[PDB]
Design an enzyme around this catalytic site. Structure first.
Site, PDB file in Angstrom:
ATOM      1  N   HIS B  40       0.781  -1.309   0.027  1.00  0.00           N
ATOM      2  CA  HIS B  40       0.067  -0.085  -0.083  1.00  0.00           C
ATOM      3  C   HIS B  40       0.815   1.225  -0.199  1.00  0.00           C
ATOM      4  CE1 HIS B  40       0.682   1.322   4.178  1.00  0.00           C
ATOM      5  NE2 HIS B  40       0.453   0.005   4.399  1.00  0.00           N
ATOM      6  N   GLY B 142       3.391   6.006  10.879  1.00  0.00           N
ATOM      7  CA  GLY B 142       4.834   5.888  10.404  1.00  0.00           C
ATOM      8  C   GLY B 142       5.577   4.437  10.566  1.00  0.00           C
ATOM      9  N   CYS B 144       4.261   1.451   9.895  1.00  0.00           N
ATOM     10  CA  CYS B 144       3.984   0.382   8.655  1.00  0.00           C
ATOM     11  C   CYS B 144       5.283   0.046   8.046  1.00  0.00           C
ATOM     12  CB  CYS B 144       2.871   0.946   7.560  1.00  0.00           C
ATOM     13  SG  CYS B 144       1.410   1.474   7.966  1.00  0.00           S
TER      14      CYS B 144
END
Ligand code: 3WL
EC number: 3.4.19.12
Lengths: 298, 296
Positions: B40, B142, B144
């Site tokens: 993503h 932040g 991920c």
């Protein structure tokens, strides 16, 4: 959601070595061309209140210490005693040495421990220096010489080397100049620590962490005087709150919107009434091993 | 002396990088000459409602992904999709790649998380794969791409990559093949975790730990069958106990002299009557495994 976190241990793992003297093996910290370890590695079973460490060490040579860095063995080309630590000088300088300093941490402050065994790291956890200068840690046989540290930027502040477990099961050690925390000595005699207390500044930090996380149930509309609160603290084995403590909590009082004296009212109510089966930040006990600084970082 | 302990993180820190695509940066895992990260990353805030990843991926080139390993920049030589992961083939092979595997973690098991921000490791903590396939982690904006892992010997078993927070406040992600844990999808949607259940294996392990530590008011002389225990447990949203769970409790049972089904008879009474403190608290811990307990 809000949990104890340890610093990433990689810069420390690179410094862990295994030190053997005779039939005894423990961990040591390898920085530049020096290895530090607890001095009782020279010590057989005459650890039993016998040890004259000056006498035991005069009889030793560089040869009598074997230091392994992973697979490689390092040549001891020197040795000296700094308080309760051995300083072994070696021929090779640790390529992995980080930026670092030695600091002596004060009671109530927190740090990460890298629990080691035969020089290979095994676990990392966060903990605190208790008011009675012990740590309620997790140290098995072979963890001696494991170090505690904080990291700020690229710099590693070592603050603790592990030496022994007390009868009560708490742990005792030194800073990296080899001076013990507390009244302890490195001899296999029975030793009691002072009666411990609860770190008020940390509980208050934690209550702020709960508010900042959306947990307001314990608050109330009341307030109390620094001294009026401190009177409740003594009845409950809590450290008196200093005016400086209040000043430390200032930034957290701001973001939360709760005055430090108000949070004391809330805490005072929690200690008197209990929690009635509810939970704060997931715990059912007043949690005293996060510092204001810790809570700020999360 | 019972604390949650995380594995040493250093063998993983050596593998953390920073992937940027557009105005969105997150973390990536750099093993050999490939960099793994959530697919993503290529989405825009707009394309987050119903994204067609194959479309968005075809509309991108190598030069569309910035991969930074510290000050150094790594050059993207290739890119493909693997389920919900992007695989970026890179300029250089990681000098610090350890011995590793990609394992798929089962619910109830635990692992260590290396929470990273901008490719920079921030902290290490331990947690467990919940039965509903979430984790109750600690992931700010932040995180991920941060990775979860176990170490056995010198080998890193990677088991989780972080992708999303659900509205519950809990977290969802994939193994290192890009297959999600649970029914979740990397699209902004109305997904939410199912009803969670308590990991009964770990509660029983916690009781053995408390017995070892001198807390033993909760024992009783009643007994129970596995089947009559499992029937009670499920009424209280506790996982039923499998045959394998009973065996995994073998060592702790012998060390204590409390037979597994006798500890189950104690847990049964705690479920039906309530508590009084165990190891200091009034809620039963369920993220301490039998293995965590035997280590001390
Ligand atoms: O807990 C320990 C205590 C002592 C000790 C020796 C003399 C007087 C007081 C304590 O030595 C140790 C050596 C180790 O290799 C180790 O893993 C340990 O846990 C210990």
């Amino acid at each position: 959601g809000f949990r104890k976190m340890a610093f990433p241990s990689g810069k420390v793992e690179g410094c862990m070595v295994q030190v053997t003297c005779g039939t005894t093996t423990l961990n040591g910290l390898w920085l530049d061309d020096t290895v530090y370890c607890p001095r009782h590695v020279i010590c057989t079973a005459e650890d039993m209140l016998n040890p004259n460490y000056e006498d035991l060490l005069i009889r030793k040579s560089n040869h009598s210490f074997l230091v392994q860095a992973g697979n490689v063995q390092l040549r001891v080309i020197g040795h000296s005693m700094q308080n309760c630590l051995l300083r072994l000088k070696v021929d090779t300088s640790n390529p992995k040495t980080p930026k670092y300093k030695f600091v002596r941490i004060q009671p109530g402050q927190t740090f990460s421990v890298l629990a080691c065994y035969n020089g290979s790291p095994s676990g990392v956890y966060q903990c605190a220096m208790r008011p009675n200068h012990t740590i309620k840690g997790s140290f098995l046989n072979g963890s001696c010489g494991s170090v505690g540290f904080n990291i700020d930027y690229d710099c590693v502040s070592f603050c603790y080397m592990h030496h022994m477990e007390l009868p009560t099961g708490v742990h005792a050690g030194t800073d990296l100049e080899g001076k013990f925390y507390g009244p302890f000595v490195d001899r296999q005699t029975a030793q009691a620590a002072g009666t411990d207390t609860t770190i008020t500044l940390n509980v208050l930090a934690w209550l702020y962490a709960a508010v900042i996380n959306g947990d307001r149930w314990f608050l109330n509309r009341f307030t109390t005087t620094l001294n009026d609160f401190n009177l409740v603290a003594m009845k409950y084995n809590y450290e008196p709150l200093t005016q400086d403590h209040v000043d430390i909590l200032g930034p957290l009082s701001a973001q939360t919107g709760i005055a430090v004296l108000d949070m004391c009212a809330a805490l005072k109510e929690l200690l008197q009434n209990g929690m009635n089966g509810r939970t704060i930040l997931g715990s059912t006990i007043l949690e005293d091993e996060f510092t204001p600084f810790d809570v700020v970082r999360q």
